[PDB]
Amino acid sequence: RPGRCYRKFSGPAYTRREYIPGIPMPKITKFVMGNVNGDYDYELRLITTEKGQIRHNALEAARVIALKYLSKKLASEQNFALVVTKYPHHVIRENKMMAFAGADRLQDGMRLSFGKPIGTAARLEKLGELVMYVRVKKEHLEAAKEALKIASSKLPIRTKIEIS
Amino acid sequence: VARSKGYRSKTRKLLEKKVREKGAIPKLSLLMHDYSQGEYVVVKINPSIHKGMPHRRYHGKVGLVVGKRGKAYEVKVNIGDKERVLIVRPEHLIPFN
Amino acid sequence: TQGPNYRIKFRRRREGKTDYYTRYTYVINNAIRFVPRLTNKYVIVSVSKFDQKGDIMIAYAHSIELVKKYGWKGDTNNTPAAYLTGYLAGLRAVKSGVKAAVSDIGLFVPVKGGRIFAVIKGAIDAGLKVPVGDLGKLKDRVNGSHISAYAQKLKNENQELYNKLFSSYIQRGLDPVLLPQHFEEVLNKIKEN
Amino acid sequence: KENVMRRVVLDKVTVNIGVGESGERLQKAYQLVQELTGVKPVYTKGRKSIREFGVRKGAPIGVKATLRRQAAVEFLKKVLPAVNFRLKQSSFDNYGNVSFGIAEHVLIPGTRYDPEIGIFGMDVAITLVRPGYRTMKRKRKKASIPRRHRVTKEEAINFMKENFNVTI
RNA sequence: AGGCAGCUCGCGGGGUAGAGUGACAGAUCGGGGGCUCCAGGCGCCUGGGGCUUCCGGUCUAACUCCGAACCCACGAG
RNA sequence: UGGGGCGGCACUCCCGCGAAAAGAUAACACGGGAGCCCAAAGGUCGGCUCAGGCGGUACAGAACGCCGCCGUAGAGCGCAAG
RNA sequence: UGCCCACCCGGUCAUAGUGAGCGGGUAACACCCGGACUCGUUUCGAACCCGGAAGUUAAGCCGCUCACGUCAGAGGGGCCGUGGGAUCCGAGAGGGCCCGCAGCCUCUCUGAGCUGGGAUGG
Secondary structure (H helix, E strand, O other): OOHHHHOOOOOOOOOOOOOOOOOOOOOOOOOEEEOOOOOOOEOOEEEEOOOEEEEHHHHHHHHHHHHHHHHHHOOOOOOOEEEEOOOOOEEEEEOOHHHHHHHOOOOOOOOOOOOEEEEEEEEEOOOOOEEEEEEEOHHHHHHHHHHHHHHHHOOOOOEEEOOO | OOOOOOOOOOOOOOOOOOHHHOOOOOOHHHHHOOOOOOOEEEEOOOOOOOOOOOOHHHOOOEEEEEEEEOOEEEEEEOOOOOOEEEEEOHHHEEEOO | OOOOOOOOOOHHHHHOOOOHHHHHHHHHHOOOEEEOOEOOOOEEEEEEEOOOOOOEEEEEEEOHHHHHOOOOOOOOOOHHHHHHHHHHHHHHHHHHOOOEOEEOOOOOOOOOOOHHHHHHHHHHHHOOEOOOOOOOOOHHHHHOHHHHHHHHHHHOOOOOOOOOOOOOOOOOOOOOOOHHHHHHHHHHHHHOO | OHHHOOOOEEEEEEEEEEOOOOOOOHHHHHHHHHHHHOOOOEEEOOOOOOOOOOOOOOOOOEEEEEEOOOOHHHHHHHHHHHHOOOOOHHHEOOOOEEEEEEOOHHHOOOOOOOOOOOOOOEEEEEEEEOOOOHHHHOOOOOOOOOHHHOOOHHHHHHHHHOOOOOOO
8 A cells, every 4th residue: 555545644643552453563673773882973863844654664664774774884783873763653544344345245335434453653743853863983974874864765754864 | 422421421530539639538627617598609529429429510610509408508500591409418519719 | 658649648647646537427517526535644525616727625624623623632544533524524514605515536445434434424414415325334433433442452462552643652642442432522522613 | 774665575476376278177276286375276267269278268277376474485485495406597587576486396395295186387486575566556646666666686686595595 | 670692800610732651551662780590602601581670762532640722600890 | 324235233221532621512433331230249336458579487388377577559349441 | 924845626638748867855745554343355454445653765756957759939951832813835734923821841959837726844
């Protein structure tokens, strides 16, 4: 299903697991990469621009692409560390019934059209919220710029970078 | 989905009490003072006391002491353009102003 | 106190003074309190009434005046002392203007023939109108016949029970056997004033 | 001297029989400790049922006896020679409490026999007191005493070595 | 002969927006310290398993220690 | 009844959420319950204070009992929730 | 004199709490003495009940000090809303702006028991 289907907000959040049975397992499993507690100098972060919800599926892909670019750069345990901030707390639900029941004269249409859990999203509620960030030294900010930027290529929403 | 018209329906925090005043009835000082006709009172339901609990529909309002029956009082309150009488024990009444 | 969740019971409850549930009933029923509290050295009786800034005691009496204004000679925290002060309370109460009230007890176990019931009877006999269950004290306890009977065994413990008090060494001749006789004379003394 | 009532005294020795069951053994245990203590014991109702070890709520699962002044102190005198060497400092807490049991109660140098009732072990608990605990136990002005007024472990050992000439 | 569709003042009610999660209920990411067990290597070290503590972050229509604007009651104007 | 039928009961009553800090407020919205049970699980009086954790004692054990310390509810209160 | 100092009877219901340390008692208050009678301990005078009352400030009580909990004041930092209006911007989501209001968290510093009714003590 296309990413344009869940970009905006359709109703409130969706969080209580005990109230919402059967959540598909999110793609993301690891959230921290690199030698945390390692010595770093440049302190660049990532900032979003407009509101919305981001599917975990893209994020996990964004997680992988960032790692390989850095991994080939120097190493995976070297003087760098990647940490993604948000978590897919939000859950999306879709009326899939038009697929199976939508061809057998069952209760089709908007009949009983409550959504069904198929994916999760990391919710964004503040203008300019952190999504991920990376810590390096003085000598590798240039590689870090596009490293975030290439990840941002896959994000659904417009993003912003900074240097610190 | 129509909601049940339970006598305490939709009260998840209406009858919630701030933790600082839990337990049995503390404010004995309010009760001991006695009302007479023509007095003006404010209804503030105590969720703890199960006796003479007025319905939620008239909570936090202005009441008038019109008489006394038994240990309890009866109170006149205007809600719409009608009149109503609420017979209640005093332990949800606080003087106005 | 361990955080915002921790609740604090009242000062009296923290100090174990009064049972509010009992006090609760008097408030809702506007009961006028009769309070025969006891301490290790004397007896305390009061007639209370509720008010905004706190309780108001209409009349009050203490064991101390019995040895000061009425010349009591025996103990100040026993049954005869308990009865005497209760009888005093009513006389103050009667001239006070009150007619009826309710005994307020709290932390005294309702034992029949105990000091507490001994106190209330005196106020009753003083003329104070207070309905009471009929399982109160025993008549012989008021005059302390048991005490003198207990005292009469002084032939056994090589001494009288009334080991002389803080000042009874050479000032107060405690007379344990002649106890009830000393009761009436003070009772006669207090009956007319 | 203010120390005369900061002193440590012996009080309320605990005479508890642990059987953990109900029936046909409590009765003999009840009378067995009866002549040992000279007072009528009390059964112990069961706590929350566990369904294992055969324990249920409200079921009498033990025998308890308690002795007081001039009786608790002499009771220790006749059981100490059995277990004078059994005393270990490890069994003394920080609050002046220590308990000692026996695998089989034949060790006591008493006038006991071996009737058809059988044989048993025994558990004994020792309580030490600095005068003034009444406030913690009285009805009025309930309160707690600070650790300063409590009985410490070292003085507990002293009150065992003294007045009882017990080992360790 | 008062009436009240508005406002102001006075005097009350509120758990929503928001905010917080060591304040409960849950969700959830990591590091540090200590304790414990296992595997490997040369008593030690490494890796893994469980426990604790400290530090940091990520959410809640069915979480609320808090909490507006705001809306409402009554008296007077 | 987002045609009708099939589907299901949103057709009787109750908890929360929906629902937007007065009230009322829709959904074939969501998460759930009831068609009972209790002569004691009821009235009153009296007494004790829980879950849990720590130290010591034969069997004794993380958890049968016993002696001490802490434990603001983390237990418990019949049946779902508040 | 006195008034406060505790006490009994309270109101406020933590700014009043908890924990530790120290100080105060010949009165008051407890600790503490003892149980024959009252009553009472599914054992016990433990506790309760009664009779008491030597000692004693160690408990408690009380005051003070320090910690934490906790109410506020200020400072720093965190975070950020909402009514009223427009053929305003933006495709939308959203945002600015003029008219009215704010509060929220978290660190630092500074305070932190008040009060009615009666018998002791100064």
